[PDB]
Every structure is written in C-alpha cells, then in structure tokens.
Amino acid sequence: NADVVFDFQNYTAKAGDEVTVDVLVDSKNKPISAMDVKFKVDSPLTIEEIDKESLAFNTTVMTNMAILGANFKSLDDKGEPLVPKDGAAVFTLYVNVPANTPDGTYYVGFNGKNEVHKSNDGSQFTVASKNGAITVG
C-alpha cells in the first residue's frame, strides 16, 4: 500500500469553463522534504497554468509549463521536512475546457513522474493517486 496518496478530487464543468484543480495529499502525517512531478489531462482539456504556490507547504513551486512539470522543497526554517497542512492544496492547476468539448469524463493526473522525497539522501516514498474526474456536461 502506498506511503502517500494524492487526491486530485472530482469536478463538474460545462464546455468553455475553467476548472481549478486543487491536488491534495494524505501522507498519514509523515513529513515530506520535496516533490518533483509532471501532470497531464485528457484531451481536449488543457492545463493552462500550474500555480507557483504550494499552500500545503507554504513554499514556491518551480514550474516548466512546456512539460507540465513542477517541483519544490518543503522544509521549515531550520531545514526540517514538513508535514503537509491538512486540507490544503499541494498543487493548484488551472484547466481549460474548450467550448466544443463533447460531453464526457476527462481525467487530470500525473504523467509518469510523481517523486515524493523523504529526506536529503535520495530516499523516496511510494506514491498512489486517486480521483481527478472532470465530468463535462
């Protein structure tokens, strides 16, 4: 069973809407030192922007929109890895639903990179994800 589980949450939209996706995490109150991830969404939806703040960790997220990549370090003022703030977005994504999107369910999630680091030595947690359904009607 995964050490930490991301909840992309579920959303409803109509064609033409922007959806704000708040990605939550449950680490079972374990601390996390850093994340380095990539995102995707089912076509024809697009991720238009990755927010540069992580509310769960009160830190700046570095992004590369060309690969939908994002990373950060999550340490307190003495360098200790942080427990994520319960209920707070770890990442926020802004998703565009084009005007001509057919009715359907379109998933947002990770795209083959989802690193969650434990410490300072390369050790990582195992990771799972759930939800991320954007139901367009």
Add this chain to the structure above:
Amino acid sequence: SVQKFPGDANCDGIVDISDAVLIMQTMANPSKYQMTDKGRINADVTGNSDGVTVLDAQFIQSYCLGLVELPPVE
C-alpha cells in the same frame, strides 16, 4: 584527483531534488546537516565557482525540470 559529479550534493550517484534539499538544510542548520568535501564541490553548480548558496539548490530544481544543463566535469 577524483572527478567531481556536478549536482550530486549528497553523493548518492544521481542528481535529483534531494540534492537541493541537502543544500538548503546545510544553510538552515549547519550544526545538524553537512555536506562532505566532495559533496560541497559537487553542489556548486552556478555562480562561477562562488561557493554554495540557495541559487545552487534552485539550479538543481531547474535541472530536474529540464531547463538547464549541469556544468562541466573536472
């Protein structure tokens, strides 16, 4: 001489965001967190051999995102 491995602050044989974490920690609490002599050499990746600062940690983050290249091995 032993060839350096630019980016590999923690000397685990790969460059990834844990290297940025170690850099930050060594400045936040030097009593608790240190780099080895090799790690410190490895960690200075930008700034023209100015020493290790937060900009080195950020450069490793950029590298993990595909935005920059690490400096030459010596």
